[PDB]
Amino acid sequence: TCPFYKKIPGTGFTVDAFQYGVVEGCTAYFLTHFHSDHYAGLSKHFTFPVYCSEITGNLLKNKLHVQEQYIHPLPLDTECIVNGVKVVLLDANHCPGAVMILFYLPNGTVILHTGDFRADPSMERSLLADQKVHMLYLDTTYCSPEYTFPSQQEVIRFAINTAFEAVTLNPHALVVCGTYSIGKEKVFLAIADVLGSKVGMSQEKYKTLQCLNIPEINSLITTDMCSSLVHLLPMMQINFKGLQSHLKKCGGKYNQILAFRPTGWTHSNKFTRIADVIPQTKGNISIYGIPYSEHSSYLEMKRFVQWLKPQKIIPTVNVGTWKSRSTMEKYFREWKLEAGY
Ligand code: NI
């Protein structure tokens, strides 16, 4: 059965609710982004209308073979009417095609569902600025002050300089980057660009990337591994055994691997600056964990909420334990009293 925090009251609508079978009285299913926890249940057999971004619609059609007659892509930043209710999709600053959804209920309530997001001050000048929001369904993944991490830009700077240094010292080093879902494409694209290489990858990952409307992409990616010095592998193969094995397969073209694992937060963020990050090394293999986040830090989340001043907040993440729930409500209250709404 569908949980309450995936239901939009006063509408026939649900959000990211595809694993519950037919939801009672749902006339349209919204999908915020193509990540498996969110799309779980969709397939070629799905026969209700799905509302999403253009990019999420490309992935539905090509990766999950959802039939075209049930995919309803909407433009961003545009007022649209769905089953008699005005909606707007806004960029979520998460992975490609990820949106937030603004619902204008017939009775005059306004609801913002963030989907998964990384809050940014640029959001303070979208269509959000123009009106009041009564209810916020909030991505609370890192809703605790221990969750600090650098900007995306600082992390990319670190990775580019690291990769460029290594390959200039050793023209026979291979760079490998781990992946398991869409998102974080900038890590491997920026490295391949500084090295003047294309990124090499499996046919299935190349297909996924071809759905994302990235400009000049035929210029940046390839399935010919032999011509590339930046390879993508599944995240699970980013360990000393998986990488030794990959190196065997390259047939003596390379004698060193420099590998990156983009994680979200890890506790080494509470002690270490990005400048100070060091790899784990075994022989001719090094592995860097880099804190490239596509979710709000605690401070970024707080700033967005204190700007928006919603009347009620409903968390969508970390909702399964009483200790989590209690902690989150305490921070929402602090934020409200500090800013005076
Ligand atoms: Ni996500």
Domain layout of the chain by residue ranges: 1-147+296-341, 148-295
266: helix, strand or coil = coil
Which experimental method was this entry solved with?
A: X-ray
CA of 263 to the centre of ligand 1 (A): 13
- What sign has the CA pseudo-torsion 109, 115, 120, 126? negative
CA of 295 to the centre of ligand 1 (A): 8
Measured in whole angstroms, the distance separating CA 203 from the mean position of its chain's CA atoms is 22
Residues 6+ apart with CB under 8 A from 163: 175, 191, 194, 195, 258
Helices (H), 35-172: 36-39, 54-62, 152-169
CA of 252 to the centre of ligand 1 (A): 38
DSSP type of residue 17 = -
CATH topology classification for 148-295: Rossmann fold (3.40.50)
Measured in whole angstroms, the distance separating CA 166 from the mean position of its chain's CA atoms is 29
Tokens of 154: 């600082």
Phi and psi at residue 14, to the nearest 5°: -125, 165
CA of 310 to the centre of ligand 1 (A): 23
CA of 297 to the centre of ligand 1 (A): 15
What is the spatial distance between Cα 303 and Cα 33, in angstroms, rounded to a whole number? 23
CA of 113 to the centre of ligand 1 (A): 14
Tokens of 97: 């095609």
What is the spatial distance between Cα 147 and Cα 142, in angstroms, rounded to a whole number? 6
CA of 31 to the centre of ligand 1 (A): 11
The CA R_g of the chain, rounded to the nearest whole Å, is: 22
Resolution number, Å = 1.8
CA of 94 to the centre of ligand 1 (A): 7
CA of 229 to the centre of ligand 1 (A): 29
Tokens of 198: 């294309």
CA of 180 to the centre of ligand 1 (A): 12
Tokens of 277: 């990050």
CA of 171 to the centre of ligand 1 (A): 36
First-to-final CA distance of the chain: 35
CA of 262 to the centre of ligand 1 (A): 14
CA of 139 to the centre of ligand 1 (A): 10
CA of 282 to the centre of ligand 1 (A): 32
CA of 35 to the centre of ligand 1 (A): 5
311 membership: H or E segment, kind and range: none
CA of 101 to the centre of ligand 1 (A): 15
CATH topology classification for 1-147+296-341: Metallo-beta-lactamase; Chain A (3.60.15)
Q: What angle do CA 208, 172, 234 make, to 5 degrees?
A: 25
Measured in whole angstroms, the distance separating CA 20 from the mean position of its chain's CA atoms is 23
Instruction: Give the number of residues written for the chain.
Output: 341
CA of 336 to the centre of ligand 1 (A): 27
